[PDB]
Subunit: 163 residues, 4 copies
């Protein structure tokens, strides 16, 4: 067979990358419940380095609940603080992944594969141990890096507008 | 003499001009309404959405600030037009966002990412009306440089900044 | 139902179809000459170069097998047309490469590289004429997927394989 | 100022990358003349790893003088053998950089910047210590890697056709 490099992104990789984020989120919440804040922040570090692209510079991360002075988490620390708190630089961050998440559903409205990047926009539904679901409007942009792994370079999350 | 060169990549200069042009279009739609009525404003918005968005390519990932849950995502040109100027019983909740007598637009980017052929910005946009009332949104834009060298919006996530 | 999806990336399937279509065009130009004359063949090549090359975007990086040093690089549609069908005193050395009664085309890729929106192939192409004489070239192609989803040749380096 | 990642390629980087290849070629030829085959093959290794993209898989390298059975050097070894010989797997390769090169001129006919890759086509003129110039028709494709460095992923070189 002919040797082929493939920097492009398929629809399959996009949907895997998206699922992988949910696995990562639940793993943090799960770890927090069983092993406490220490192991879970350790976990979330390997997650953010794996799933995000703070390697390349700023990530365009606007988290659902971030507040005016630190709305955009362009730093690896900004993301980790959103996910697990415990960073006096983000006083208002209690740790979004610490809410005992157990299930994540991705509901895409549209996907745009623009060469070696891909963008999804849709809903994400995260449900906890007691069944309380939360719903965000979400835009993800993945970049396929030199090693063939998708990396989050844009992450805009917002609470659905209501009346 | 100069080497002939085709350049499909986007430059920072191109991105910033594109954000600027959007704001200029927004105020043009609002200003045409106040000065010429719904018809002339709706007509301008059609040319605007056709010029600055990429619906030609397929869906645009447009999630507007104040769209409601059955029609959160405006993947259709008619969804984008309806959000801006209302007047479409297919989108009954749409009063016409661009009709609020807007007069100034301010782009404060927090980060820019040029993926080569595309470019994403994320930051704040601050629009202010005839009487000086300012609205701030958190916005993510994605611009594609088309075969003709024009940047088009293929992604547009707007949201009210979270509070309390 | 299916998620609406815009796909600007090139797939291996798309690349191979594109190489195949070029060979099919080549034999169509040669076969139209033998069966209809220069005029009909030149007319076909115009549609061919317009369909399969990307001169619309600017220069195409076309270096043909047997072009000579003042006009080595055919960056112009007229250069590409002249190389294929001659008949252009602007390119006096051009007898019309596609007029040699070609009948079969074989693509043997050595490597394929999909850069996302574009794709490059490098390998051999073996074209054979009405009487069974085969010519082998070392070819590099670059295909761009245009806003309409059609792969276009923006790079085309052909060369005689080196000997002794 | 606003933080910005820039995977794109500029015209300036293309022309720098091209010059850098020539520097690399002359460095090998120069080293060979003063320090022999050992230091120069060592040099050419760091060059091919630096300038080429055999990291990502096959490079589309068709060298000027490669012969029918091994026309395409899709392997790091294939390139090194073209440049400095000394590899029983490429018997016919005497080492193209071993010819005491001193000057390299790049004469571009066209450049195509297709996002985060760029393609040049033109002439290259390489002249040796005695002034004997050699002229190739050359196509280069550069990929800007996760670290911002251009890498050769396509390299088609051919002797100009004559009568």
């Amino acid at each position: 067979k002919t040797p082929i490099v493939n920097r492009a992104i398929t629809e399959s990789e996009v949907l895997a990358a998206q699922k992988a984020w949910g696995e990562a989120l639940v793993a943090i919440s799960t770890t927090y419940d069983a092993k406490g804040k220490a192991s879970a922040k350790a976990l979330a570090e390997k997650v953010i380095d794996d799933a995000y692209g703070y390697q390349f510079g700023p990530v365009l991360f606007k988290p659902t609940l971030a507040i005016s002075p630190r709305t955009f988490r362009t730093t690896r620390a900004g993301a980790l603080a959103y996910f697990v708190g415990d960073d006096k630089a983000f006083p208002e961050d209690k740790g979004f992944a610490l809410s005992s998440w157990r299930k994540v559903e991705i509901k895409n409205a549209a996907i745009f594969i623009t060469g070696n990047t891909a963008t999804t926009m849709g809903n994400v539904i995260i449900t906890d141990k007691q069944g309380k679901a939360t719903t965000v409007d979400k835009t993800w942009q993945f970049l396929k890096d030199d090693h063939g792994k998708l990396r989050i370079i844009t992450h805009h999350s917002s609470l659905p507008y209501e009346q």
